[PDB]
Amino acid sequence: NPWTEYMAKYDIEEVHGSGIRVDLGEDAEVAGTQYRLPSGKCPVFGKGIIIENSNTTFLTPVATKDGGFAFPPTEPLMSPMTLDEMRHFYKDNKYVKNLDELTLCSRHAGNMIPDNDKNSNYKYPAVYDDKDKKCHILYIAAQENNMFCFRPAKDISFQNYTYLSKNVVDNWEKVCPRKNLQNAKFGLWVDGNCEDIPHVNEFPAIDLFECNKLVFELSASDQPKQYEQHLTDYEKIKEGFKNKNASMIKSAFLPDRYKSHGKGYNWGNYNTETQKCEIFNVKPTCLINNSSYIATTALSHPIEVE
C-alpha cells in the first residue's frame, strides 16, 4: 500500500483512541472515587456543547442554569487565558512555552489540580478559541445529559472552537485529521487499487458543514447506553460529572463497557454535486481521485478545505 503513511491519520481508533461525539475514554481517581474524563489524542475541531432551552453559552463560567461549563474565577485567573498569557506564564518551561497553540491549551488545562488532590491524574479538558486566541478550561467534563439538559454538536457558532482532552498529542498536525480533502473520496486499498467502501449509508446534506455535522452526530461515543429513569449520582458520574452543590459526587454502585476506543461512524464522503453525505464505520486506507467528493471525518474542521 503506497497510501499507508498518508492514510495513517484517518485510523481514528489508532490515532485518537476514544470517543468523538462524547469522549470519556479514561477513568481517574479524585479523592477516592474514579471519575470519567476525556482522553482522545486528537483535537476535535468545531465541537462545542449546546445547552437546550437556554441562551447561556457553554464557555460561560459555571454558576457559583445561569452558567456554562467553563472554569470559574481562580486567583490568579487561570481561565480563560490568552495564547500570549500562556506563553508568558510558562516562560521558564523549555518543554512547554513553545508548544503549538492547541497542545499548550491542553497542557495548561492539565496543570489545574482537581479538588486539592495533589496525587490525582485527573485533568480537566479545554476548548481553544482560534479567533480570540483564548484557552478556556472546562470545569464540567460531561458532554451529554439528555438541572441542565445539553448535547455536543458542531454548530456554525463553534467553527473556531476546538475541544481538547488532557491527552492531545504535540504533533497532532502530523498525525490527526483537520482539513477536509477536496476532490477526494475515501476508499479501501485492495490488490493495487483504491476501491469504494463497500457499505455506506447516504443522507441529504446541503453543504459540507451539514455533512460534517451528521458524521459528528453518528461518530464514536463513550456516552452510557443503559441508565436509570431519573438522574442519580451513579448516572452523573457515568456521564462525566464530578461535582454537585459543594461536594464531590460519590456512589456505592461504582465497582469498561461504555468506552468506544474510537470505534464508530467517524468518516464521510460528501458528494458536492448530488448533496449527499456518505457515512461509514470502517477506516479508509486510500483516496480515490473523484472531483465530485470531499472526504471528511468527525474530528475534522467542519468548513476548512485543502
Q: Which residue has the cell 481517574?
A: 28
Contacts of 37 (CB under 8 A, 6+ apart): 24, 26, 27, 28, 122, 123, 124, 125, 141, 165, 166, 240
CB 19, CB 222: distance < 8 Å = yes
Between 117 and 210, whose beta carbon lies closer to a second copy? 210
Give the number of residues written for the chain.
Answer: 306
Between 134 and 259, whose beta carbon lies closer to Cl ion?
Answer: 259
Helix runs in the chain, H state only: 4-7, 12-15, 83-89, 101-109, 172-175, 208-218, 233-238
Residues 71 and 136: beta-carbon distance below 8 Å: yes
Binding of residue 238 to Cl ion (CB under 5 A)? no
Residue 51 has phi, psi (to 5 degrees) of: -90, 125
C-beta nearest to Cl ion: residue:
258
Query: Distance (Å, rounded) from C-alpha 247 to C-alpha 243?
Result: 6
Q: What track of x and - describes contact with Cl ion for positions 105 through 134 (by CB under 5 A)?
A: ------------------------------
Q: What residue 229 binds from a second copy, Cl ion, none (CB within 5 to 8 A, per partner kind)?
A: a second copy
Q: Taking a C-beta distance cutoff of 8 angstroms, is the pair 239, 223 a contact?
A: yes
Cβ at position 207, least distance to a second copy in Å:
5
Q: Does 35 bind Cl ion (CB under 5 A)?
A: no
Cβ of residue 253: shortest distance to a second copy, in angstroms? 12
**Closest separation in Å from C-beta 225 to a second copy:** 7
Residue 258 near Cl ion by CB under 5 A: yes
CB of 206 to a second copy, least distance (A): 5
Nearest distance from C-beta of residue 154 to Cl ion, angstroms: 25
**Chosen from a second copy, Cl ion, none, partner binding at 259 (C-beta under 5 to 8 Å by type):** Cl ion
Identify which of residues 27 and 207 has a Cβ nearer to a second copy in the complex.
207
Best CA proximity match to 301, nearest among 182, 149, 142: 182
Distances from the Cα of 156 to the Cα of 6, 46, 213, 235, 258, angstroms: 29, 8, 10, 31, 29
Minimum Å gap between C-beta 93 and Cl ion is 34
Nearest residue (CB) to a second copy, 68 versus 268: 268
Query: Measured between alpha carbons, how far is residue 193 from residues 142, 182, 213, 286, 287 in Å?
Result: 43, 20, 30, 8, 10
Residue nearer to a second copy on the CB measure, 136 or 213: 213
CB of 217 to a second copy, least distance (A): 6
Site size toward Cl ion (CB under 5 A) is 3
With CB cut-offs between 5 and 8 Å by kind, which of Cl ion, a second copy, none does residue 234 bind? none
Distance CA 282, CA 12 (A): 10
Give whichever of 145 and 285 is closer to Cl ion, judged by the CB atom.
145
Distance in angstroms (rounded) separating the CA atoms of residues 175 and 286: 16
Shortest CB 70 distance to Cl ion, Å: 26
User: What is the rounded CA–CA span in Å between residue 117 and residue 151?
Assistant: 29
The site for a second copy (CB under 8 A) is made up of 21, 146, 156, 199, 201-204, 206-207, 214, 217-218, 221, 225-227, 229, 256, 265, 275, 279
Q: Is 259 in the site for Cl ion (CB under 5 A)?
A: yes
**Nearer Cβ to a second copy (93/291):** 291
Sites of contact with Cl ion (CB under 5 A): 257-259
